[PDB]
């Protein structure tokens, strides 16, 4: 996206774009609620069957 933006529009547009991408990225990443529960680390059904 940034390379495209650069080769097309130029420098100014990219710096802005790059920042805005970063800002919305962080913001919406935080809105997601993204966490690290231990039920998030799902072991497959049949591990004890394979080993």
């Amino acid at each position: 996206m940034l390379n495209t933006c650069y080769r097309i529009l130029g420098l100014k547009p990219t710096v802005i774009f790059a920042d805005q991408i970063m800002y919305t990225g962080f913001a919406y990443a935080a809105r997601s609620g993204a966490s690290v529960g231990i039920d998030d680390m799902v072991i497959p059904e049949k591990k004890h069957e394979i080993i």
Binding site: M22, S35, V36
Partner: protein, 249 residues
């Protein structure tokens, strides 16, 4: 105390020799912030001596890393204590168990990038409880030397000074116990001998305009380092065996 420990907590705190554990079991005859007095039971107590152990707890003083060292009593007045029990807790110990840091309600989620690369977002409520507020114990020293020109001494008489600087000092030239200090304020007044001094024309005129003719002695008073600010908790004076003393000494 740590809510999420291993059990090794007490073992560390006790064996470190930073806490004060009971040599003999019995009832604490007297509790105090400075010391602990415990009465020994008949079975343990020796028949020869009286049988009352003394434990003068190490109170707030310095560390090798310039931090606090305290021993608070973890026992109540007149409490029955068993042999080998923690009587006073150390600087990082709680009911004998190790207490290095503090536990708190944490939540894993990003926050407008204020936790970007492992960056931490802490509540003001943590700062309000002053719970992560650590104590630093610095030790600034002041040396009276014997130069080729003559001996140095330690008096309140310092040339080129504000009454504001000599306010926290006494007559001897040492800051009071409990006096708050800040970078630029002088802890201990010192003066060294000043030799053949070429008073530059612009200084001979300036010392002849306002006056205040300085004496034959240089200035080198120990002043709080530019930036540091705390409370003086104690001051200790070491002297050779000779020259008469300051009144504060």
């Amino acid at each position: 105390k740590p809510l999420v420990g291993t059990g090794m907590e007490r073992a560390v705190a006790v064996d470190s020799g930073v806490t004060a554990v009971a040599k003999r079991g019995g009832v604490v005859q007297y509790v105090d912030a400075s010391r602990i007095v415990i009465k020994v039971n008949e079975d343990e107590m020796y028949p020869g001596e009286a049988g009352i152990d003394i434990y003068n707890l190490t109170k707030y003083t310095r560390s090798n890393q310039n931090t606090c060292i305290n021993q608070m009593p973890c026992v109540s007045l007149g409490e029955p204590v068993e042999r080998g029990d923690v009587l006073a807790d150390g600087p990082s110990t709680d009911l004998g168990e190790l207490a290095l840091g503090q536990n708190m309600r944490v939540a894993f989620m990003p926050w407008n990038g204020y936790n970007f690369e492992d960056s931490i977002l802490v509540s003001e409520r943590v700062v309000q409880e002053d719970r992560f507020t650590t104590i630093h114990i610095q030790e600034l020293a002041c040396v009276s030397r014997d130069t080729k020109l003559g001996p140095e001494e330690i008096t309140a008489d310092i040339p080129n000074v504000g009454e504001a600087a000599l306010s926290k000092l006494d007559e001897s030239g040492i800051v009071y116990i409990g006096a708050e200090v800040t970078g630029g304020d002088i802890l201990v007044g010192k003066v060294t001998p000043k030799g053949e001094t070429q008073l530059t024309p612009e200084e001979k005129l300036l010392r002849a305009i306002f006056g205040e003719k300085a004496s034959d002695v240089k200035d080198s008073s120990l002043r709080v380092p530019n930036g540091v600010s705390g409370t003086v908790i104690d001051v200790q004076v070491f002297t050779r065996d000779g020259v008469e003393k300051d009144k504060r000494a």
